[PDB]
Amino acid sequence: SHMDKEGFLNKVREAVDVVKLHIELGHTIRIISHRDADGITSAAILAKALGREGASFHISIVKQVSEDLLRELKDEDYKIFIFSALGSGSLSLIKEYLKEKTVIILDHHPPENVKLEEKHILVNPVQFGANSVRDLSGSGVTYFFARELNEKNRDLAYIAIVGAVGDMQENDGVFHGMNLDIIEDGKSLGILEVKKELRLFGRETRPLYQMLAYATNPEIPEVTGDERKAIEWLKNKGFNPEKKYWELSEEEKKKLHDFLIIHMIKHGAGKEDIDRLIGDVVISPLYPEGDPRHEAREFATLLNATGRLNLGNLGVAVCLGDEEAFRKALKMVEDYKREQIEARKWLLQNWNSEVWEGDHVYVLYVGKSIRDTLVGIAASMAINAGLADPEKPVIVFADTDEDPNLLKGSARTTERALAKGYNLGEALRKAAELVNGEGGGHAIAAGIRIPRARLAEFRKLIDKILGEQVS
Ligand SMILES: Nc1ccn([C@@H]2O[C@H](COP(=O)(O)O)[C@@H](O)[C@H]2O)c(=O)n1
Ligand SMILES: Nc1ccn([C@@H]2O[C@H](COP(=O)(O)O)[C@@H](O)[C@H]2O)c(=O)n1
Ligand SMILES: Nc1ccn([C@@H]2O[C@H](COP(=O)(O)O)[C@@H](O)[C@H]2O)c(=O)n1
Ligand SMILES: [Zn+2]
Ligand SMILES: [Zn+2]
Ligand SMILES: [Zn+2]
């Protein structure tokens, strides 16, 4: 990939001009944002930026831009809608249901290849050469929107990076694309620092043995999922296992890094996993050490915890400095992490007996054993736990809140699988059109909803469609 950065920024400036037309008239800005760290930070960036202009706004945090959602937004009397961190795969639907409204899409998903009307403006870095999961996230698009609207919005650079980390834009251990420009803005203001550190959840709030035991991206062999063994390993290497990572000296951190790298090599971990163990970690002196907001991944996890309970609006308030919202959000992270480890335990126990393996895909139907909103994490964990061939994409389906006749599915894969030609977003979109469902997303990570009774048909279909992508 390679971004035309100034061309993208000129498109951003075009959207800023449109939103200013509505601010002048006192129009309330309707905001629809994705239910994850990327979308929650996106909405907070818009809330702070519009607040600086004295404009009013109304935020909803949602899972997807569905035809049903757009039917609802069609009847709302707002004059302008901003979709942030989602929507680029729903341009035809937005064109239909919001035809007589002004729409701004601040997003980084692979855009639907259709023509938009004059009052609908897509602001998407992928259209200017970006890799959708690496060069900029939804919070990043929203950040540059806010920055062009008012230069004072550069103080949102850390919140923007929180969304990027939540979206795993530094999944290979380093930041890329225009995320590096946001980082430079934040450094100039002194509100963020980039450290070369252990890229695991728990730098601020977890004891070291839980930082190691929670590691699923990448896993630490023999230690992941076993706090007792994590304690034994840490003590044997000379570390107080109850200490938090932020309490280690820089000398002690580097010693831990060496021990972990040697451990992964001795247990045969792959080069890709070793390379993303140590890398860019973003902290912020705006918050105290030991506070999850002090580090981007802990902050993103805190926001994801509010989204999981359908309290994304509380996550927005956390980003905006509401300390009472922060105290509530702290109480949601423990159940969030515990359920992920339980999902991994179920996968290890049931993968061999339940998974359907085609020529180009694994399809796992977990029934009700894993929450519908966790099937994506589960698919990724099947790869990281070594259950799945890294070159074969994994799709996990579960029963879902949304509909008793529906299955919610998530697809995940690796960069080496993408090198073979697979594109999960495109494959799921095309398969959904044939089994009376709905799907799409990134090449490396995508979602789909299908009727439960069409699962067997879907498995054969998606295997064939993925195979046709193999060049
Ligand atoms: N392999 C993986 C994949 C996801 N996760 C968790 O899932 C969260 C969000 O995952 P998605 O980006 O797939 O929605 C991450 O921030 C992390 O807490 C994990 O712990 N291990
Ligand atoms: N119909 C769909 C379903 C999911 N997606 C995208 O696919 C990605 C992964 O989906 P899940 O998080 O639902 O597994 C998300 O970025 C989501 O916005 C999409 O663009 N169109
Ligand atoms: N290298 C990467 C980068 C992102 N991802 C996934 O891509 C998705 C991006 O989230 P959105 O669809 O919400 O933008 C997340 O599920 C994230 O875990 C990945 O699976 N591998
Ligand atoms: Zn260039
Ligand atoms: Zn998102
Ligand atoms: Zn995103």
Side-chain angles (χ1 to χ4, degrees):
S1 66
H2 183 84
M3 283 207 66
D4 174 14
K5 312 211 305 301
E6 199 62 33
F8 169 75
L9 289 181
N10 287 331
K11 169 63 65 181
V12 170
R13 303 182 171 105
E14 176 184 346
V16 167
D17 290 339
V18 170
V19 74
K20 286 207 253 186
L21 288 175
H22 293 265
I23 294 177
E24 292 169 340
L25 297 171
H27 293 169
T28 296
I29 313 299
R30 184 67 163 104
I31 295 172
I32 309 296
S33 203
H34 202 202
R35 191 220 268 191
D36 58 354
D38 199 29
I40 290 173
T41 55
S42 288
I45 291 164
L46 289 168
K48 172 86 100 68
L50 294 173
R52 280 185 154 112
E53 310 303 321
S56 66
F57 50 89
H58 184 223
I59 296 170
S60 288
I61 303 301
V62 306
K63 251 181 289 184
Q64 84 269 16
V65 180
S66 59
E67 179 168 3
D68 297 315
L69 176 68
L70 291 166
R71 217 193 330 269
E72 296 274 347
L73 301 178
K74 181 168 186 291
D75 294 351
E76 299 185 352
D77 68 323
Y78 300 99
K79 297 297 179 297
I80 173 175
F81 298 74
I82 297 181
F83 296 84
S84 55
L86 41 44
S88 295
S90 303
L91 299 178
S92 290
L93 289 174
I94 292 170
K95 179 201 312 182
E96 172 182 357
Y97 285 90
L98 301 179
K99 178 186 299 183
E100 307 305 327
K101 300 299 178 62
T102 298
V103 180
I104 304 171
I105 311 291
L106 308 174
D107 184 37
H108 71 114
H109 290 80
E112 187 181 2
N113 181 27
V114 302
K115 169 180 170 57
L116 289 180
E117 9 210 12
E118 70 145 19
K119 46 171 55 182
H120 297 181
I121 163 156
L122 171 61
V123 186
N124 190 321
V126 175
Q127 295 196 306
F128 298 86
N131 181 312
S132 69
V133 297
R134 208 187 291 256
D135 293 324
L136 201 63
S137 71
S139 58
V141 180
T142 306
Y143 170 79
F144 286 109
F145 179 85
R147 188 185 77 171
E148 181 62 31
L149 176 62
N150 189 330
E151 142 274 326
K152 289 290 183 295
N153 287 315
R154 291 199 293 261
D155 70 355
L156 292 157
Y158 177 59
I159 295 300
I161 293 300
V162 171
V165 171
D167 254 24
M168 301 191 356
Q169 296 252 320
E170 35 56 280
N171 188 63
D172 66 339
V174 298
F175 287 91
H176 307 264
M178 292 188 70
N179 290 305
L180 295 164
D181 298 307
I182 303 180
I183 285 168
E184 287 307 309
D185 285 358
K187 287 163 57 182
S188 298
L189 290 176
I191 63 169
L192 62 85
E193 307 171 26
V194 183
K195 306 236 177 180
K196 291 297 186 182
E197 283 183 354
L198 189 56
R199 292 183 59 259
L200 302 175
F201 163 82
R203 178 195 200 275
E204 308 294 339
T205 63
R206 295 295 178 152
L208 278 169
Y209 72 85
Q210 284 191 341
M211 187 179 190
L212 300 193
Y214 279 141
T216 58
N217 186 31
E219 295 198 351
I220 299 166
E222 303 298 329
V223 165
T224 291
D226 196 330
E227 289 177 358
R228 288 201 297 173
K229 290 195 185 179
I231 289 167
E232 295 286 3
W233 188 91
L234 283 161
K235 293 174 61 179
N236 275 319
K237 300 303 176 185
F239 297 93
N240 182 345
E242 291 287 348
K243 214 176 291 183
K244 316 226 198 310
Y245 182 88
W246 75 265
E247 297 174 303
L248 298 174
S249 77
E250 298 302 308
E251 153 71 35
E252 287 165 339
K253 295 178 185 175
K254 293 182 181 181
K255 195 161 69 73
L256 177 59
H257 302 164
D258 288 358
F259 280 138
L260 285 172
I261 291 171
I262 296 169
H263 180 80
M264 296 178 70
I265 294 180
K266 287 195 299 175
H267 287 274
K271 181 177 191 306
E272 296 83 354
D273 289 340
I274 294 169
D275 285 347
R276 54 204 195 87
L277 186 74
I278 311 299
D280 291 345
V281 170
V282 183
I283 61 167
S284 172
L286 294 173
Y287 310 90
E289 294 165 296
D291 189 304
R293 297 169 292 181
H294 183 260
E295 190 271 325
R297 174 170 272 99
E298 289 238 26
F299 206 155
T301 297
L302 182 68
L303 302 177
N304 282 336
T306 74
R308 167 187 170 256
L309 294 178
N310 203 28
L311 294 171
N313 285 140
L314 192 91
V316 174
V318 173
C319 297
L320 295 177
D322 189 317
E323 203 67 13
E324 183 50 55
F326 169 71
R327 287 189 288 266
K328 292 179 185 300
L330 274 180
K331 302 177 180 180
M332 309 176 184
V333 181
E334 179 64 24
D335 194 55
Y336 178 86
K337 297 305 292 179
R338 289 184 180 186
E339 194 181 2
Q340 296 184 348
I341 297 306
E342 181 64 25
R344 180 181 173 276
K345 289 218 285 77
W346 190 95
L347 290 174
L348 273 47
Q349 175 74 37
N350 294 93
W351 175 270
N352 278 7
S353 62
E354 300 298 322
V355 76
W356 183 96
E357 184 178 356
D359 292 314
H360 304 275
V361 74
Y362 299 97
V363 179
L364 176 66
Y365 172 47
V366 309
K368 296 166 178 155
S369 297
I370 301 177
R371 182 187 300 249
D372 57 355
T373 57
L374 257 65
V375 290
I377 302 163
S380 173
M381 291 191 309
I383 301 171
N384 287 306
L387 296 171
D389 188 339
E391 296 189 334
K392 188 167 290 187
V394 179
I395 308 180
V396 179
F397 281 102
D399 299 348
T400 174
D401 272 353
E402 308 176 359
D403 193 332
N405 293 256
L406 223 61
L407 300 182
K408 174 60 176 66
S410 287
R412 299 292 188 269
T413 196
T414 66
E415 275 290 333
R416 35 222 144 117
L418 296 187
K420 290 171 56 184
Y422 300 120
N423 182 327
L424 297 184
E426 277 299 305
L428 290 188
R429 182 191 63 80
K430 295 169 51 179
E433 279 302 295
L434 300 177
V435 295
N436 281 125
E438 176 201 71
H442 302 283
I444 206 170
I448 186 167
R449 297 159 168 81
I450 66 164
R452 165 196 243 93
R454 301 260 224 151
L455 176 63
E457 174 185 351
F458 168 85
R459 293 186 303 202
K460 320 248 196 64
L461 176 64
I462 196 67
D463 201 42
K464 158 191 165 181
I465 291 172
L466 286 166
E468 291 171 343
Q469 297 179 328
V470 181
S471 333

